[PDB]
Design a binder for this molecule. Sequence first.
Ligand code: BMF
Length: 110
Amino acid sequence: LSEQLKHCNGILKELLSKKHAAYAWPFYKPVDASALGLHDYHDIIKHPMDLSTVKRKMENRDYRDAQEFAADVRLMFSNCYKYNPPDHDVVAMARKLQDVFEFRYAKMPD
Ligand SMILES: CCOC(=O)Nc1cc(-c2ccc(C)c(NS(C)(=O)=O)c2)nn2c(C)nnc12
């Protein structure tokens, strides 16, 4: 891990931590469209993403740089904003978790 990717790994640890679990847990595993009845989910969302996938990629040392890590995390959030109306509970949860991500990601030394 580069120093930037070590920083990203620490961010991932925080996003997965009990501190944020009350709004992070819908992002812990891939959206299960069949169980939830999200009929059009895989038509609307071309590239699903979630924290278990980010965690797998980081653990396997698959990210080439910090930008690749950030793109996945933002893809996860953007999918949630794209699929859901603005007043849905899960959009508010996404925003609270993204507050954590964007602030800590911005503090990455460069
Ligand atoms: C028409 C109503 O729209 C929605 O219900 N939307 C969304 C719902 C949930 C969601 C809820 C409850 C549970 C138990 C789960 N679990 S999981 C990760 O296995 O699928 C997920 N996540 N979500 C994400 C991300 N993005 N959108 C949604």
